[PDB]
């Protein structure tokens, strides 16, 4: 099953590998280090999980992070650090291996990323670019996450495809992960009782 957790520098080689498999926009390792060492609380990864059961070293494979754990998706996030707006973030890259798509991974990563940007960095909004013809990505951002289209960027990508620049305004309370536990009585942990009641 898939585990969602915060990224560390130990994940960037495999994050680059995932990017390299899933997207035409690629970056040198230096650029991932710049992200993970500037905004060490903002990026998240999705990995397989091999839990011990009641009933080796690592595979020599570019997705593997540890024995029984390989990287299947990531979200690489930064704060905007150009020249004097209020604080805002950028989703530099999001991808998930194809054999693992369509089960909520991107959504989960994204919600952790938006909440972190708000919580850790007081980000007022977040921006990103996406190919106009990317149905899956548009559905995620526009429908699932309620991003807005901010503009059309003509010939934005290298092969010449136009992008949408998209934006979402961030507010702490509505981004709390507990708001999204039920797809559809919404019981919650009050963090008080004894759970074995």
């Amino acid at each position: 099953p898939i585990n969602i957790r915060r990224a560390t520098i130990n994940d960037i080689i495999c994050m680059q590998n995932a990017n390299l498999h899933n997207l035409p926009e690629n970056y040198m390792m230096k650029y991932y280090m710049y992200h993970i060492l500037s905004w060490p609380e903002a990026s998240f990864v999705a990995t397989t999980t091999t839990l011990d059961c009641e009933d080796r070293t690592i595979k020599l494979d570019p997705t593997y992070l540890a024995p029984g754990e390989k990287l299947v998706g990531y979200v690489l996030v930064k704060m905007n650090d150009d020249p004097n707006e209020p604080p805002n973030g950028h989703i530099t890259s999001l991808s998930v291996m194809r054999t693992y798509r369509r089960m909520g991974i991107a959504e989960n990563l994204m919600r952790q990323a938006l909440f972190a940007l708000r919580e850790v960095h007081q980000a007022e909004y977040v921006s990103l670019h996406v190919r106009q013809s990317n149905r899956a990505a548009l559905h995620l951002y526009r429908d699932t996450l309620a991003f807005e289209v901010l503009s059309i960027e003509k010939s934005y990508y290298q092969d010449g495809e136009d992008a949408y620049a998209m934006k979402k305004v961030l507010k702490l309370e509505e981004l709390q992960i507990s708001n999204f536990t039920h797809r559809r009585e919404k019981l919650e942990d009050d963090l008080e009782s004894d759970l074995l009641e």
């Binding site: 997207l23 926009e25 530099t92 934005y156």
Partner: peptide
């Protein structure tokens, strides 16, 4: 996806 080219 950010394109570092432009």
């Amino acid at each position: 996806s950010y394109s570092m080219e432009h």
